[PDB]
């Protein structure tokens, strides 16, 4: 309930602002782009290719690749 505009839909956050890619994302719009699983600050997820990825998908990548994809969310994720 901060009041940011979920860059995912460009509309005022209707729930919690999921800071992704340093932008504000709706918990309703932000969803594992690899599973369509609704993303929530309580659920486990990561940023990949500028898209959300559930921890299960982040695990579907080779151990040496996930550490590289996680490198994205580290700077292109929560701020």
Q: Which residues bind Zn ion (CB under 5 A)?
A: 6, 8-9, 26, 29, 32, 34-35, 54, 57
Nearest-approach distance from CB 43 to Zn ion, in angstroms = 10
Do the beta carbons of residue 31 and residue 38 sit within 8 Å? yes
- Residue closer to Zn ion by CB (options 20, 32) is 32
- Residue closer to Zn ion by CB (options 37, 76) is 37
- Residue closer to Zn ion by CB (options 6, 69) is 6
* 69 Cβ neighbours under 8 A, 6+ residues apart: 46, 48, 49, 53, 58, 61
Nearest-approach distance from CB 37 to Zn ion, in angstroms = 6
Nearest-approach distance from CB 32 to Zn ion, in angstroms = 4
Torsion of CA 15, 2, 46, 29, to 10 degrees: 40
Taking the mean position of all CA atoms in its chain, how far away is CA 58?
A: 11
């Amino acid at each position: 309930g901060s009041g940011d505009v979920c860059f995912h839909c460009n509309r005022v956050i209707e729930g919690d602002v999921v800071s992704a890619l340093n932008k504000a994302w709706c918990v309703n719009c932000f969803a594992c782009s690899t599973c369509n699983t609704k993303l929530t600050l309580k659920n486990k997820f990561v940023e990949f290719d500028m898209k959300p990825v559930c921890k299960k998908c982040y695990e579907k990548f080779p151990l040496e690749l996930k550490k590289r994809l996680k490198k994205l969310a580290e700077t292109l994720g929560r701020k």
